[PDB]
């Protein structure tokens, strides 16, 4: 059966043949309680102490118990269970080519990475999960150390030169849809440039940026509070158009125009913005080692090995022991070995043949320390570091948690209508909530004046 | 559209004509794809198939070599349960 | 796209990697989450102690 | 009076997220229950459910 199946594709052999021959059987959870299942065929069937000797079934591969996001984790059994769960949750937030036909889609919020490389160490399960074709990360030369100090409490130090060359560079797309419709017998919307005369209700922003049709042309600069569509409603006209959200800033990619189901002019416009990795961006490897870029140094400032190889990322060594994520270290070592060799390695969870000693023995056959440690140099003064830093390739990702999408301020912004108090939400330009817990904290401090200023002066003064 | 028309029409001649038109369209599309992918798009698939074949044979030779070199297996970082 | 070739999928502005199996209502991709419940036609027995019954067989 | 969240918007942020959301499950138990027996990973979820992929908030 193995050979007839290996010679598949070319002929016409499939899983139905095995099911029909009677080599595989679909067992459910209620029947699995009455079978003597086995893990591996060879190990659990030779001749040792009579443990059972009455096996009825045998799993294909133990690692198969893993799911989709938990499968991409290399060496998941070498880590703690909480970090594997955190990684399965963060893997869904990784950026990259989410779909091959992204230039046709008009979805809202879409992040596409420029150079999504493939993991240097891929499990034998992602081959079917289809992660190698549409990856979500780059293999970076990570050096576990405490270089300057900006990576001491779950933070990283990226290489400015690598970012310049195009290290985890991505583009973010934001779409905007707008359809005209018949509000009432006398009310009616139409796409048209709201001039400075006929239109009464109008915003204090630029309007000549768009063409006469009212739709902004592709490949045009746009900033916050810039008109993107020319919707005017006849009362003579009120500017009922939409503007690019504040703090957006980008360039128009394309514009689509059609007729919705109702038959009115419906347009979609997506603006792209190239997000250069800056400090504050959230990163995470395949083991739950989440972090934020603290500071970025240039290649001249970053350390360097005996040859021109500066680390691209520097995590916090203190983030290793407490979390017990030795799978990450094993991955880095195997990635160094794979890059020196010339082929992707295996990181299957249960393999009985991927230990650390053998990987170290292979690595030692290339001029590197069997354990992966290497001698660096203080990039600033150029002196050797007494401690031999542990540097090697490792696959990192980039989450959509940008620093620009979260920064927010306020200085007497808009107010609600029910209770004249600040709005809520970054999009609506709202203020932060001074919670009851903050009230109690201020009470404990004894700053009644500050407390009243927060809950009255800068909240909702009224007489 | 041709497939839908052929499935909807019950006449034998109409079905045969629709099948012939669909076959001609598919052949033309395949010829255009081949002419467009004669370079790069086809070389990449060729290298991929030969590389997966090379990987399969590499794995098989590694497995047979591991089965052959069964002299001794004394290692430290490894263990297995043993009930009873 | 029932058993269509990757060629036609690409010609129709779609990719063969899309797992599919999601609705498109009002232009949005809708996916149904598999809900779970107690298996019907099976008799369970529980011993709720915060009540007047010592044991309870449910069907 | 009916359920909520049975049909969600397919998260098209990356291929892994699309696949996960298509193969996701959901329990009907009330949100934030004082009990702690239904959240724990039962031994029976071997080869049937991913023992690691799961949120970390209230659900």
């Amino acid at each position: 059966h193995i050979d007839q199946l290996k010679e598949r594709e070319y002929n016409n052999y499939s899983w139905q043949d095995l099911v029909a021959s009677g080599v595989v059987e679909y067992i459910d959870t209620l029947e699995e309680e009455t079978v003597m299942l086995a893990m591996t065929p060879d190990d659990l069937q030779e001749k040792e102490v009579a443990y059972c000797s009455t096996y009825t079934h045998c799993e294909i591969h133990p690692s198969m118990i893993l799911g989709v996001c938990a499968s991409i984790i290399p060496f998941p059994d070498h880590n703690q269970s909480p970090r594997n769960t955190y990684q399965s949750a963060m893997g869904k937030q990784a950026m990259g080519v989410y779909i091959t036909n992204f230039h046709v889609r008009m979805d809202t919020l879409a992040h596409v990475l420029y150079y999504p490389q493939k993991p240097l160490v891929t499990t034998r399960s992602m081959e079917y999960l289809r992660f190698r074709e549409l990856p979500a990360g780059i293999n970076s030369i990570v050096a576990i150390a405490s270089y300057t100090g900006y990576n001491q409490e779950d933070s990283v130090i990226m290489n400015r030169s690598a970012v310049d060359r195009g290290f985890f560079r991505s583009v973010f797309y934001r779409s905007y849809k707008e359809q005209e419709s018949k509000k009432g017998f006398d009310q009616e919307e139409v796409f048209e440039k709201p001039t400075r005369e006929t239109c009464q209700g109008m915003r204090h922003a630029i309007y000549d940026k768009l063409d006469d049709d009212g739709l902004i042309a592709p490949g045009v600069r746009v900033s916050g509070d810039d008109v993107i569509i020319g919707k005017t409603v006849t009362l003579t006209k009120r500017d009922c158009s939409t503007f690019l959200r504040t703090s957006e800033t980008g360039i128009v990619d394309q514009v689509m125009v059609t007729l919705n189901q109702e038959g009115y002019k419906f347009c979609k416009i997506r603006v792209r913005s190239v997000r250069i990795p800056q400090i504050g961006d959230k990163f995470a490897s395949r083991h739950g080692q989440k972090g934020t870029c603290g500071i970025q140094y240039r290649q001249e400032d970053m350390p360097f090995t005996c040859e021109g190889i500066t680390p691209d990322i520097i995590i916090n060594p203190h983030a290793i022991p407490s979390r017990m994520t030795i799978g990450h270290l094993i991955e880095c070592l195997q990635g160094k070995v794979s890059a020196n060799k010339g082929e992707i390695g295996d990181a299957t969870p249960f393999n009985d043949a991927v230990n650390v000693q053998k990987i170290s023995n292979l690595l030692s056959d290339y001029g590197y320390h069997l354990r992966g440690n290497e001698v660096l140099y203080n990039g600033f003064t150029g002196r050797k570091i007494t401690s031999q830093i542990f540097i090697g390739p490792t696959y990192y990702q980039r989450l959509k948690h940008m620093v620009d999408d979260k920064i927010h301020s306020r200085a007497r912004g808009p107010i609600q209508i029910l209770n004249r108090q600040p709005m809520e939400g970054r999009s609506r330009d709202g203020g932060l909530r001074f919670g009851e817990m903050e009230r109690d904290c201020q009470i404990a401090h004894g700053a009644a004046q500050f407390l009243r200023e927060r809950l009255f002066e800068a909240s909702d003064p009224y007489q | 559209l041709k497939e839908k028309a052929m499935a909807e029409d019950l006449g034998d001649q109409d079905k045969a004509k629709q099948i012939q038109d669909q076959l001609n369209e598919l052949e033309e599309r395949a010829e255009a794809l081949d002419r467009q992918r004669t370079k790069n798009i086809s070389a990449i698939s060729y290298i991929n198939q030969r590389n997966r074949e090379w990987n399969i044979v590499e794995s098989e030779k590694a497995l047979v070599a591991e089965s052959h070199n069964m002299k001794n297996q004394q290692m430290d970082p490894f263990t297995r349960r043993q009930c009873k | 796209l029932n058993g269509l070739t990757d060629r036609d999928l690409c010609e129709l502005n779609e990719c063969p990697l899309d797992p599919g199996g999601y609705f498109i209502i009002n232009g949005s991709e809708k996916v149904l989450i598999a809900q779970e419940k107690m298996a019907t036609n099976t008799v369970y027995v529980f011993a709720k102690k915060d009540s007047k019954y010592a044991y309870t067989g449910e069907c | 009076q009916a359920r909520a969240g049975v049909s969600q918007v397919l998260n098209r942020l990356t291929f892994a997220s699309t696949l996960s959301h298509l193969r996701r499950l959901n329990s009907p138990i009330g949100r934030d229950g004082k009990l702690a027996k239904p959240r724990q990973l039962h031994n029976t979820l071997w080869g049937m459910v991913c023992p690691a992929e799961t949120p970390e908030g209230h659900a």
Partner: peptide, 28 residues
């Protein structure tokens, strides 16, 4: 003939065939 030892490679041919026959969203 039984396949002793030499099984780490045959163990994945069956998985490959299963995934090629049935997709990931086959249940839906």
């Amino acid at each position: 003939e039984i396949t002793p030892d030499l099984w780490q490679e045959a163990c994945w041919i069956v998985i490959s065939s299963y995934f090629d026959e049935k997709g990931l969203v086959r249940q839906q």
